[PDB]
Amino acid sequence: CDNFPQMLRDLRDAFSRVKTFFQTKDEVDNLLLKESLLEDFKGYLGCQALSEMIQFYLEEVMPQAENQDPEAKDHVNSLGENLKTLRLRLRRCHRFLPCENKSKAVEQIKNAFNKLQEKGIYKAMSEFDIFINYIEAYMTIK
Amino acid sequence: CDNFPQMLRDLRDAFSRVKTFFQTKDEVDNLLLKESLLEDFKGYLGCQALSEMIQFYLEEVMPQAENQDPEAKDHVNSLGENLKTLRLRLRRCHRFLPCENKSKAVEQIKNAFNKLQEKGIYKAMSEFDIFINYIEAYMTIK
Amino acid sequence: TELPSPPSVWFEAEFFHHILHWTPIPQQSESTCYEVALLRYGIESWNSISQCSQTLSYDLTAVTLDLYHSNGYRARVRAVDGSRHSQWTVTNTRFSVDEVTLTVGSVNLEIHNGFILGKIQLPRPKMAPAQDTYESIFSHFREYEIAIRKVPGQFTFTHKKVKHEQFSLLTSGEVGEFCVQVKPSVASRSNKGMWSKEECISLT
Amino acid sequence: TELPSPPSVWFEAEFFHHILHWTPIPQQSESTCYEVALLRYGIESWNSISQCSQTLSYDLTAVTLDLYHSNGYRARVRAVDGSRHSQWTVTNTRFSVDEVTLTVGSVNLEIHNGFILGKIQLPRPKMAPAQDTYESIFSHFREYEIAIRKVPGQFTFTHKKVKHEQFSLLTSGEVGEFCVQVKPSVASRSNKGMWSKEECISLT
């Protein structure tokens, strides 16, 4: 689709420049990222899991780190950009991060409604019967 | 799965008790919910679309209405509960509203990390290499 | 001095039988008739089906065949006499599949083993495309309510419910005749139905 | 008075050839040897592979076969002399597929039409399960860098890149011999490779 292989690598590279500084410290040796996560990944919450993980690594993990070990600041940040950058090229090729994209149809419509003032409320409520005919359409897709 | 048919109906019923009050007013007669939405529904943003729509009807639409035509308040609210109630029974049978659920694995882990203080940062950064081995695993699932 | 609009217009649908109905303007003179006009929700284009109708009902099935593939219609009627006319009186609600009353073709009863089998021929309306069978439109969730009466007996009934056009009824042997009626619906929808014409079966 | 720990321990892997390496404690006496210990990331269980080794390298391929299905290992070495020993010196980083240096079995050259075909036999290590072929583990993204030298010529090269173990090279006719080397990698990964042993081919 976009740049599958490469972007992965660009990422591990940002890590090779840090793998050490951090693996040095790690003392207890039990797996945090239990293969159970690989299960949520091979699942329907898969998109959520991955998005929750990236959300995890850029807001909790790295943040608390870049600062924790200042000498690491500059490089953790670098990796944490190849991540930001992977997210995008990803939630673009819709086939992968759909749970992070948003419908245009829902906006176009959400637009029409806003530009119909007091009247928009009426037509919205009048077609709800169709909304229900759609929602059902979505359910037959299983 | 849960209660597919019925819950749909329980919903249209909440509408039959209002269909009028609102269809009376509707004057211009162009389709708001363009079949394009049914397209975002038959798509990968499908979960987003539906979630964005419900988000639309319970926060913008109904809210501005229940109040707009007070005499309608009591019943719009009723429908808007069979909706709230459909959402749940839906984002339960994961097969349908995955984009509204959240991974346990991501929590268990997100838990471990929180209960590892200053050390959690190190192990997280040390296994990131595996995180990348997972993310790739997720991509081969396409 | 300017003709009165018809008090109200409304549909009385049934699988392909979308008759429109209205009430007469007060003091309707022997020369007044009405004008029937349709509208396919989605196009601000009203089409005049009838120029004059000295009735209070017009059958719009033919111009509403797309009903079960469209997003409803809007009818409206107007009174006409001489050069003057009454304001249009539009239907209060949109006409979709919602407002179609579910009926059933018929029911044939066969007295077997010591039980009774019965299949429900769904409705087959002439002005109905082949592409649109009651099963096509209503693919899943067809349920029926069954009312069985006994004779000789009292005008009382047993109530049951099925999910297929072919059902059976546990018989106890001791009766001289049974009569049945059905009432269809679709759990996914809130469409009202209509109890079939009674279909008795002699057990003797 | 208490033996010195080895300054550093590190791996020098290659598709199934996970040799461990370390540097000697200073003033290593003729009676000192070292103890090699492993650890499967995921189990706080260190296993002693060797009790004594008067070397500075131990081949741990056999106890690390699961490398490409596991989440790495942690080795550590210790100095031993008499009743005393040196603190353990663990590897600074976890040993996974990451640190394996990509090499290639060989390359055979065939001089055809006026072009040269060449297939790259990937590496086939004895101590490697059948279930694990270089292609299995590394299913997709196998790319190679090719360096072609000309003779008679100067020690200069042409650089190319392919995506299959069989490539060709547009020949211009006028040479008396060509030599080639390869360097594998996997775009998805940052694994370093190693230029193959030169494989010349006479054009005459």
XYZ file of C-alpha atoms in Angstrom:
692
model
C 0.000 0.000 0.000
C 2.082 2.940 1.312
C 5.599 1.932 2.497
C 5.135 -1.289 4.520
C 8.627 -2.825 4.834
C 10.751 0.271 5.089
C 8.759 2.201 7.703
C 9.077 -0.850 9.996
C 12.851 -0.750 9.665
C 13.148 3.027 9.979
C 11.620 2.182 13.341
C 13.848 -0.594 14.573
C 16.792 1.603 13.495
C 15.658 4.368 15.828
C 15.782 1.615 18.455
C 19.167 0.101 17.694
C 20.518 3.494 18.703
C 18.968 2.966 22.139
C 18.520 -0.790 22.621
C 21.541 -0.642 24.913
C 21.068 2.320 27.198
C 17.823 0.565 28.191
C 18.587 -3.163 28.025
C 21.554 -2.464 30.319
C 19.263 -1.413 33.121
C 16.539 -4.042 32.702
C 17.223 -6.491 35.572
C 14.174 -8.675 36.245
C 13.687 -10.798 33.126
C 9.990 -11.597 32.663
C 8.047 -10.722 29.493
C 5.906 -7.582 29.913
C 4.378 -7.649 26.421
C 2.871 -11.062 27.108
C 1.956 -12.997 23.987
C -1.617 -12.234 25.093
C -1.193 -8.826 23.485
C -0.244 -10.663 20.273
C -3.616 -12.267 20.806
C -5.516 -9.005 21.076
C -3.554 -8.140 17.950
C -4.710 -11.258 16.121
C -8.190 -10.256 17.248
C -10.961 -7.783 16.507
C -9.746 -5.461 19.241
C -6.540 -5.638 17.200
C -6.857 -2.096 15.964
C -7.646 -0.957 19.510
C -4.731 -2.881 20.963
C -2.225 -1.414 18.526
C -3.672 2.078 18.930
C -3.756 1.639 22.698
C -0.144 0.493 22.616
C 1.126 3.381 20.550
C -0.960 5.576 22.837
C 0.865 3.841 25.639
C 4.401 4.318 24.316
C 4.120 7.960 23.363
C 2.240 9.235 26.411
C 3.235 7.070 29.381
C 6.366 5.071 28.564
C 8.675 7.384 26.530
C 7.459 10.623 28.167
C 8.328 9.373 31.682
C 11.632 8.163 30.213
C 13.002 10.859 27.896
C 13.038 12.890 31.120
C 13.923 10.063 33.554
C 17.314 9.397 31.915
C 18.064 12.766 30.366
C 21.066 11.456 28.470
C 18.459 9.368 26.585
C 16.115 12.289 25.902
C 17.370 13.083 22.344
C 17.120 9.525 21.069
C 13.976 8.307 22.725
C 12.354 11.302 21.126
C 13.728 10.291 17.736
C 12.210 6.817 17.929
C 9.039 8.349 19.298
C 8.748 10.244 15.980
C 9.262 7.280 13.706
C 6.339 6.007 15.747
C 4.254 9.140 15.296
C 5.231 8.847 11.653
C 4.281 5.198 11.411
C 0.876 5.909 12.908
C 0.025 8.268 10.062
C 1.266 6.286 7.052
C -0.785 3.562 8.784
C -4.117 5.252 9.539
C -4.051 6.262 5.884
C -3.967 2.847 4.319
C -7.362 2.425 5.984
C -6.957 -1.350 5.664
C -4.844 -1.087 8.844
C -5.843 1.547 11.393
C -9.571 2.158 10.688
C -10.287 2.741 14.379
C -8.267 5.951 14.156
C -9.871 7.349 11.002
C -13.209 9.144 10.778
C -15.990 8.954 8.201
C -16.392 11.756 5.681
C -19.990 10.750 5.047
C -20.601 11.310 8.761
C -19.068 14.781 8.350
C -20.715 15.804 5.087
C -23.965 14.896 6.851
C -22.813 16.326 10.188
C -22.186 19.399 8.041
C -25.544 19.570 6.335
C -27.211 19.266 9.743
C -25.239 22.172 11.208
C -26.171 24.303 8.207
C -29.938 23.789 8.671
C -30.327 25.330 12.113
C -33.639 24.753 13.919
C -34.780 22.763 10.915
C -31.878 20.299 10.953
C -33.285 18.786 14.121
C -36.548 17.889 12.402
C -35.161 16.190 9.300
C -32.661 14.282 11.433
C -35.437 12.914 13.581
C -37.628 12.232 10.528
C -35.016 10.003 8.796
C -33.970 8.152 11.969
C -36.179 5.414 10.596
C -33.664 5.127 7.775
C -30.728 5.347 10.157
C -32.156 2.186 11.714
C -32.465 0.625 8.262
C -28.732 1.314 7.834
C -27.566 0.063 11.208
C -29.349 -3.197 10.393
C -27.595 -3.245 7.028
C -24.311 -3.012 8.897
C -25.238 -5.995 11.085
C -25.969 -8.298 8.152
C -22.292 -7.727 7.294
C -21.225 -10.375 9.848
C -25.153 -13.426 19.508
C -26.931 -11.245 22.112
C -30.440 -10.103 21.030
C -30.103 -9.024 17.368
C -33.677 -8.860 16.005
C -35.545 -7.652 19.041
C -33.269 -4.785 20.096
C -33.682 -3.344 16.572
C -37.451 -3.354 16.971
C -37.447 -2.051 20.542
C -35.796 0.854 18.754
C -38.152 1.486 15.884
C -40.980 1.239 18.451
C -39.511 4.117 20.434
C -39.690 5.942 17.098
C -43.217 5.070 16.034
C -44.251 7.022 19.112
C -42.551 10.077 17.609
C -42.358 9.535 13.839
C -45.224 12.005 13.550
C -44.401 14.938 15.773
C -41.245 15.197 13.636
C -42.294 14.128 10.133
C -45.064 16.739 10.371
C -42.545 19.539 10.513
C -40.053 18.251 7.936
C -40.753 20.431 4.860
C -37.842 20.284 2.406
C -37.694 16.694 1.157
C -34.100 15.765 0.298
C -32.281 12.794 1.865
C -29.891 13.853 4.656
C -28.574 10.359 5.425
C -27.289 10.023 1.872
C -26.701 6.448 0.779
C -23.024 7.444 1.019
C -23.283 6.811 4.748
C -24.548 3.312 3.880
C -21.281 3.158 2.003
C -19.130 4.121 4.964
C -21.198 1.482 6.733
C -20.383 -1.173 4.147
C -16.780 -0.088 4.617
C -13.879 -0.368 7.035
C -14.759 2.958 8.619
C -18.080 1.186 9.170
C -17.571 0.891 12.889
C -16.498 4.542 13.005
C -19.461 5.659 10.936
C -21.986 3.880 13.134
C -20.261 5.067 16.307
C -19.995 8.575 14.887
C -23.681 8.468 14.011
C -24.848 7.323 17.408
C -22.477 9.939 18.801
C -24.263 12.323 16.495
C -27.823 11.437 17.505
C -27.327 11.442 21.247
C -25.185 14.568 21.564
C -26.168 16.940 18.753
C -29.481 15.869 17.222
C -31.723 14.683 20.117
C -30.177 17.008 22.735
C -30.935 20.133 20.654
C -34.398 18.652 20.065
C -35.693 17.222 23.351
C -35.393 20.856 24.458
C -36.347 22.533 21.145
C -39.866 21.035 21.129
C -40.449 20.473 24.825
C -43.645 18.532 24.234
C -41.313 15.980 22.572
C -38.800 15.906 25.431
C -40.193 12.779 27.206
C -40.282 10.610 24.102
C -37.149 11.654 22.312
C -35.401 10.770 25.526
C -37.039 7.346 25.525
C -35.776 6.518 22.042
C -32.426 7.996 22.975
C -32.185 5.270 25.658
C -33.047 2.351 23.433
C -30.116 3.768 21.502
C -27.832 3.991 24.519
C -29.035 0.480 25.253
C -28.375 -0.771 21.748
C -24.846 0.601 21.844
C -23.986 -1.592 24.817
C -25.541 -4.912 23.774
C -23.604 -4.103 20.577
C -20.118 -3.187 21.815
C -20.316 -6.439 23.755
C -20.744 -8.825 20.884
C -17.300 -7.585 19.845
C -18.004 -8.842 16.318
C -19.906 -5.554 15.853
C -18.569 -2.491 17.660
C -14.852 -3.289 18.221
C -13.886 0.363 17.768
C -15.670 1.130 21.034
C -14.148 -1.664 23.120
C -10.704 -1.663 24.717
C -8.096 -4.401 25.055
C -7.631 -6.132 28.394
C -4.160 -7.271 27.388
C -3.298 -3.596 26.913
C -4.589 -2.977 30.450
C -3.059 -5.977 32.202
C 0.209 -4.756 30.677
C -0.640 -1.086 31.240
C -1.158 -2.310 34.801
C 2.101 -4.159 35.224
C 3.933 -1.081 33.937
C 2.270 1.230 36.462
C 3.186 -1.176 39.252
C 6.924 -1.144 38.420
C 7.624 2.540 38.973
C 10.980 3.883 37.752
C 11.797 0.389 36.563
C 8.726 0.003 34.346
C 10.194 2.557 31.973
C 13.278 0.425 31.377
C 11.592 -2.899 30.638
C 9.083 -1.153 28.381
C 11.868 0.354 26.339
C 13.823 -2.926 26.362
C 10.957 -4.977 24.822
C 9.959 -2.324 22.263
C 11.876 -4.521 19.861
C 9.189 -7.124 20.472
C 6.418 -4.554 20.224
C 7.693 -3.981 16.688
C 7.687 -7.732 16.078
C 3.997 -7.688 17.067
C 2.936 -4.676 15.040
C 4.421 -6.439 12.013
C 2.480 -9.560 12.955
C -0.666 -7.455 12.873
C 0.159 -6.191 9.371
C 0.547 -9.666 7.885
C -3.120 -10.070 8.871
C -4.234 -8.218 5.709
C -65.017 31.549 -1.297
C -61.805 29.542 -1.856
C -62.382 25.758 -1.702
C -61.456 23.974 1.596
C -58.464 21.600 1.753
C -59.172 17.975 2.659
C -58.861 17.601 6.459
C -56.331 14.699 6.226
C -54.605 12.310 3.818
C -53.257 8.889 4.772
C -52.104 5.498 3.382
C -53.641 2.051 3.898
C -50.890 -0.133 2.528
C -50.420 -3.885 2.412
C -47.717 -5.770 0.445
C -48.183 -3.930 -2.871
C -51.546 -2.208 -2.359
C -50.583 1.291 -1.408
C -54.041 2.910 -1.629
C -54.197 6.590 -0.532
C -57.141 7.800 1.516
C -58.589 11.112 2.514
C -61.562 12.761 4.107
C -63.888 15.087 2.191
C -63.835 18.839 2.522
C -66.975 19.893 4.386
C -70.117 20.549 2.325
C -68.619 18.737 -0.649
C -70.711 19.699 -3.670
C -71.736 17.091 -6.267
C -69.250 18.648 -8.693
C -66.154 18.610 -6.518
C -63.428 16.010 -7.030
C -59.904 15.612 -5.806
C -56.403 15.679 -7.213
C -53.905 13.018 -6.110
C -50.157 13.887 -6.132
C -47.060 11.788 -5.200
C -43.433 12.477 -4.248
C -40.438 10.134 -4.144
C -38.590 11.131 -1.016
C -35.298 12.467 -2.352
C -36.653 14.570 -5.245
C -38.620 17.799 -4.725
C -40.751 16.734 -7.648
C -44.457 16.229 -7.053
C -46.128 14.189 -9.757
C -49.898 14.439 -10.342
C -51.298 10.924 -10.580
C -54.936 11.994 -10.825
C -56.549 15.217 -12.102
C -59.970 14.365 -10.789
C -61.262 11.644 -8.571
C -64.759 11.573 -7.174
C -63.727 8.959 -4.577
C -61.963 9.198 -1.251
C -59.322 6.628 -2.103
C -56.864 6.164 -4.954
C -54.746 3.020 -5.542
C -51.131 4.097 -5.876
C -49.512 0.674 -5.821
C -48.287 0.991 -9.407
C -46.508 4.295 -8.877
C -45.026 3.092 -5.614
C -43.551 -0.252 -6.620
C -40.126 0.996 -5.548
C -41.491 1.363 -2.028
C -39.405 -1.535 -0.676
C -36.152 -0.300 -2.270
C -36.736 3.431 -1.784
C -36.837 5.717 1.244
C -40.569 6.364 1.230
C -43.003 8.716 -0.445
C -45.207 11.740 0.358
C -48.718 11.950 -1.068
C -50.995 14.923 -0.991
C -54.532 15.540 -2.106
C -56.329 18.628 -3.281
C -59.981 19.580 -3.799
C -61.102 20.832 -7.180
C -64.323 22.571 -8.335
C -64.484 24.939 -11.304
C -61.514 27.323 -11.458
C -60.787 27.258 -7.734
C -58.975 24.631 -5.684
C -58.123 23.837 -2.084
C -54.650 24.037 -0.575
C -52.733 20.817 -0.809
C -53.019 18.515 2.162
C -49.872 16.379 2.393
C -49.521 13.116 4.306
C -48.412 13.747 7.914
C -45.711 11.053 7.644
C -43.421 9.487 4.999
C -44.677 6.341 3.357
C -42.239 3.492 3.661
C -42.255 -0.189 4.380
C -42.932 0.791 7.971
C -46.605 1.532 7.318
C -47.350 -1.600 5.307
C -49.735 -3.926 7.081
C -48.457 -7.518 7.062
C -51.079 -10.003 5.873
C -50.903 -13.604 4.650
C -52.109 -15.291 1.458
C -53.830 -18.220 3.123
C -53.390 -21.388 5.142
C -54.154 -24.993 4.237
C -54.693 -27.568 6.954
C -53.911 -31.239 6.777
C -55.083 -33.640 9.437
C -52.330 -36.265 9.930
C -50.949 -38.713 12.543
C -52.853 -37.239 15.467
C -51.372 -33.818 14.888
C -52.138 -31.115 12.321
C -49.702 -29.752 9.774
C -50.224 -26.318 8.262
C -48.267 -24.312 5.716
C -48.737 -20.566 5.276
C -48.766 -19.423 1.635
C -47.463 -15.884 1.953
C -49.199 -13.191 -0.154
C -48.636 -13.138 -3.936
C -49.989 -9.801 -5.298
C -50.433 -9.439 -9.051
C -48.756 -6.027 -9.326
C -45.616 -7.376 -7.726
C -42.283 -7.762 -9.528
C -40.728 -11.268 -9.547
C -37.571 -9.743 -8.087
C -39.713 -8.881 -5.042
C -41.185 -11.896 -3.280
C -42.412 -11.493 0.296
C -39.373 -13.624 1.185
C -36.903 -11.473 -0.733
C -37.857 -8.202 0.996
C -38.433 -9.945 4.293
C -35.582 -12.415 4.152
C -35.169 -13.119 7.858
C -37.371 -12.842 11.005
C -40.706 -13.984 9.710
C -42.787 -14.979 12.751
C -46.512 -15.703 12.980
C -49.055 -15.729 15.786
C -51.490 -18.607 15.683
C -54.923 -18.748 17.170
C -56.656 -22.111 17.197
C -60.357 -22.509 17.993
C -62.220 -25.787 18.739
C -65.627 -26.921 17.572
C -67.961 -28.024 18.920
C -66.761 -25.488 21.451
C -66.908 -21.985 22.850
C -65.583 -18.948 21.061
C -62.233 -19.252 22.886
C -58.696 -19.687 21.509
C -55.257 -21.195 22.177
C -52.301 -18.958 21.248
C -48.968 -20.124 19.826
C -46.117 -18.632 17.810
C -43.849 -19.985 15.088
C -40.904 -18.940 12.906
C -41.614 -20.789 9.645
C -44.457 -20.888 7.136
C -45.027 -24.528 8.074
C -46.084 -25.394 11.627
C -47.821 -28.206 13.431
C -50.212 -28.431 16.350
C -50.131 -31.085 19.060
C -53.582 -32.655 18.899
C -55.181 -34.515 21.788
C -57.614 -36.506 19.682
C -60.973 -35.651 21.400
C -62.288 -32.864 19.132
C -64.730 -32.743 16.223
C -63.196 -29.719 14.393
C -60.490 -27.035 14.727
C -60.230 -23.570 13.134
C -57.156 -21.428 12.773
C -56.008 -17.938 12.002
C -52.592 -16.412 11.641
C -51.051 -12.985 12.109
C -47.620 -12.277 10.589
C -44.850 -9.921 11.611
C -41.091 -9.421 11.467
C -39.347 -9.149 14.869
C -36.838 -6.697 13.447
C -39.730 -4.420 12.537
C -42.842 -3.062 14.319
C -45.206 -3.480 11.364
C -48.740 -4.353 12.437
C -50.368 -7.427 10.918
C -53.850 -8.702 10.237
C -55.386 -11.946 11.414
C -55.964 -14.213 8.432
C -59.403 -15.285 7.283
C -60.418 -18.205 9.482
C -59.444 -21.615 8.006
C -61.238 -24.481 9.710
C -60.502 -28.178 9.395
C -62.847 -30.993 10.339
C -61.197 -33.636 12.499
C -64.023 -36.065 11.702
C 41.858 -11.349 46.516
C 38.479 -12.167 44.915
C 38.779 -13.044 41.197
C 37.913 -10.262 38.663
C 34.765 -10.502 36.507
C 35.251 -10.623 32.737
C 35.131 -7.038 31.392
C 32.382 -7.825 28.804
C 30.348 -10.634 27.237
C 28.805 -10.502 23.768
C 27.324 -12.633 20.936
C 28.627 -13.146 17.392
C 25.647 -14.825 15.808
C 24.892 -15.874 12.252
C 21.947 -18.056 11.110
C 22.360 -20.806 13.730
C 25.865 -20.117 15.061
C 25.223 -18.223 18.234
C 28.773 -18.274 19.654
C 29.267 -16.275 22.900
C 32.404 -14.210 23.356
C 34.151 -12.498 26.200
C 37.324 -10.759 27.197
C 39.704 -12.175 29.810
C 39.950 -10.878 33.338
C 43.261 -9.045 33.683
C 46.321 -11.095 34.679
C 44.525 -14.316 33.804
C 46.507 -17.131 35.407
C 47.184 -20.385 33.521
C 44.687 -22.131 35.802
C 41.726 -19.815 35.369
C 38.789 -20.779 33.157
C 35.320 -19.441 32.652
C 31.759 -20.517 33.288
C 29.137 -19.958 30.576
C 25.469 -19.474 31.633
C 22.283 -18.890 29.543
C 18.777 -17.524 30.162
C 15.626 -17.807 28.050
C 14.040 -14.399 28.291
C 10.785 -15.094 30.117
C 12.127 -17.435 32.828
C 14.356 -16.244 35.688
C 16.230 -19.494 35.311
C 19.916 -19.329 34.457
C 21.274 -22.586 33.110
C 25.012 -23.365 33.289
C 26.130 -24.611 29.888
C 29.817 -24.841 30.775
C 31.592 -25.355 34.123
C 35.008 -24.567 32.761
C 36.218 -23.234 29.483
C 39.774 -22.168 28.846
C 38.699 -20.268 25.703
C 37.151 -16.872 25.157
C 34.281 -18.161 23.058
C 31.637 -20.843 23.503
C 29.260 -22.066 20.751
C 25.722 -21.838 22.083
C 23.858 -22.552 18.865
C 22.457 -25.831 20.186
C 20.963 -24.332 23.329
C 19.585 -21.391 21.395
C 17.809 -23.116 18.524
C 14.553 -21.505 19.639
C 16.141 -18.122 18.987
C 13.924 -17.416 15.958
C 10.688 -18.388 17.754
C 11.575 -16.996 21.185
C 12.020 -13.496 22.582
C 15.782 -13.620 22.995
C 18.285 -14.805 25.563
C 20.751 -13.412 28.137
C 24.181 -14.993 28.514
C 26.675 -14.318 31.227
C 30.178 -15.496 31.913
C 32.130 -15.960 35.094
C 35.808 -16.485 35.939
C 36.825 -19.500 37.972
C 40.095 -20.401 39.767
C 40.262 -22.659 42.821
C 37.475 -21.967 45.327
C 36.959 -18.344 44.323
C 35.076 -16.916 41.357
C 34.374 -13.592 39.691
C 31.017 -11.827 39.685
C 28.855 -12.744 36.755
C 29.138 -10.502 33.739
C 25.858 -10.598 31.800
C 25.374 -9.576 28.175
C 24.523 -5.856 27.894
C 21.618 -6.613 25.526
C 19.070 -9.394 24.846
C 19.991 -11.885 22.178
C 17.370 -12.148 19.494
C 17.152 -12.412 15.759
C 18.104 -8.750 15.717
C 21.778 -9.461 16.393
C 22.172 -12.265 13.864
C 24.473 -11.339 11.021
C 22.931 -12.192 7.640
C 25.288 -14.177 5.411
C 24.775 -16.275 2.277
C 25.667 -19.877 1.425
C 27.257 -19.162 -1.933
C 26.697 -18.005 -5.490
C 27.138 -19.868 -8.766
C 27.637 -17.960 -11.993
C 26.575 -19.024 -15.437
C 27.714 -17.172 -18.517
C 24.805 -17.173 -21.018
C 23.397 -15.189 -23.985
C 25.569 -12.133 -23.446
C 24.317 -11.693 -19.914
C 25.135 -13.522 -16.678
C 22.666 -15.438 -14.555
C 23.355 -16.043 -10.880
C 21.412 -17.828 -8.165
C 22.134 -17.316 -4.468
C 22.041 -20.528 -2.410
C 21.026 -19.206 0.988
C 22.835 -20.667 4.038
C 22.063 -24.253 5.119
C 23.581 -24.800 8.613
C 23.835 -28.353 9.927
C 22.405 -27.608 13.380
C 19.269 -26.183 11.838
C 15.820 -27.769 12.133
C 14.008 -28.580 8.851
C 11.062 -26.544 10.114
C 13.434 -23.548 10.019
C 14.775 -22.742 6.567
C 16.230 -19.286 5.942
C 13.096 -18.756 3.829
C 10.688 -19.861 6.547
C 11.981 -17.419 9.187
C 12.613 -14.739 6.605
C 9.582 -15.303 4.427
C 9.330 -11.886 2.796
C 11.723 -8.948 2.107
C 14.884 -10.741 1.159
C 17.055 -8.225 -0.720
C 20.722 -8.471 -1.691
C 23.412 -5.965 -2.601
C 25.615 -6.993 -5.484
C 29.107 -5.854 -6.208
C 30.583 -6.829 -9.552
C 34.284 -6.443 -10.356
C 35.936 -6.713 -13.816
C 39.177 -8.385 -14.794
C 41.495 -7.547 -16.345
C 40.635 -4.363 -14.502
C 41.122 -2.119 -11.507
C 39.928 -2.955 -8.035
C 36.674 -1.026 -8.618
C 33.042 -2.201 -8.472
C 29.543 -1.692 -9.903
C 26.715 -1.786 -7.335
C 23.228 -3.209 -7.893
C 20.386 -4.550 -5.762
C 17.872 -7.352 -6.217
C 14.893 -8.962 -4.468
C 15.275 -12.635 -5.428
C 17.956 -15.289 -5.024
C 18.305 -15.372 -8.809
C 19.496 -12.254 -10.640
C 21.117 -11.376 -13.924
C 23.648 -8.802 -15.046
C 23.524 -6.875 -18.312
C 26.833 -7.694 -19.978
C 28.452 -5.514 -22.622
C 30.604 -8.240 -24.123
C 34.110 -6.615 -23.944
C 35.498 -8.174 -20.738
C 37.772 -11.126 -19.994
C 36.366 -11.990 -16.512
C 33.892 -10.771 -13.861
C 33.800 -11.386 -10.089
C 30.880 -10.949 -7.756
C 29.954 -10.701 -4.127
C 26.646 -10.398 -2.367
C 25.395 -8.944 0.898
C 21.945 -9.968 2.176
C 19.421 -8.166 4.333
C 15.708 -7.894 5.067
C 14.186 -4.417 4.532
C 11.790 -4.964 7.411
C 14.787 -5.466 9.678
C 18.088 -3.631 10.338
C 20.242 -6.760 10.580
C 23.757 -6.217 9.254
C 25.061 -8.599 6.602
C 28.394 -9.845 5.355
C 29.748 -9.668 1.834
C 29.984 -13.170 0.404
C 33.261 -14.811 -0.522
C 34.180 -13.526 -3.972
C 32.872 -15.758 -6.810
C 34.541 -14.995 -10.121
C 33.514 -16.201 -13.556
C 35.693 -16.198 -16.649
C 33.976 -14.680 -19.670
C 36.562 -16.288 -21.960
